[PDB]
């Protein structure tokens, strides 16, 4: 006679992540606008015929 | 040295209420006539996020007492689902705090 079992294998699934996406506001915008054009408003025109 | 994010120098609120704090009889603390409550954002709890992702992988790998959820209605899968949120979570707290600084080389140097 061959005495019974003895024999078991580890439950056991081995950890890691996938997909985890870096989706922090670090760099969360990049546009923009002037703040207004140059133009000249300190002089007159002088137009006596 | 109290350190506020480079991008939060406003990070500060205020309320003042004329009703002082009181204690139940027989309790702990003073008489004050002025308490405060503060509520605080801060970078340093990322160490309880990435406490909870030792505490993940050294027991969910060994995959014990998973079938205890399972058996209630849970699968493994949402086990991993909420796994992967929290790292969103917690690699966020890993890049929030950092410098609204931008380009590449060093800051300063020398030339000829």
Redesign the interface.
């Given at each position: 006679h061959v005495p019974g079992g003895g024999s078991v294998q580890i439950?056991?699934?081995?950890?890691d992540?996938?997909?985890?996406?870096?989706?922090?506001?670090?760099?969360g915008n990049i546009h923009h606008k002037p703040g207004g054009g140059q133009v000249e408003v300190k002089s007159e025109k002088l137009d006596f015929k | 040295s109290i350190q506020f994010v480079d991008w939060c120098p406003t990070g500060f609120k205020v309320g003042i209420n004329y009703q002082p704090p009181t204690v139940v009889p027989g309790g702990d603390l003073a008489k004050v006539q002025r308490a405060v409550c503060m509520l605080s954002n801060t970078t340093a709890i990322a160490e309880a996020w990435a406490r909870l992702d030792h505490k993940?992988?050294l027991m969910?790998?060994?995959?014990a007492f998973v079938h205890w959820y399972v058996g209630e209605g849970m699968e493994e899968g949402e086990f991993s689902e909420a796994?992967?949120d929290m790292?969103?979570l917690e690699?966020?707290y890993e890049?929030?705090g950092?410098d609204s600084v931008?380009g590449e080389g060093e800051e300063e140097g020398e030339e000829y």
């Open positions: 439950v056991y699934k081995p950890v992540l996938s997909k985890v996406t870096s989706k922090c506001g670090s760099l | 993940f992988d969910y790998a060994k995959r796994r992967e790292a969103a690699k966020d890049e929030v950092v931008e």
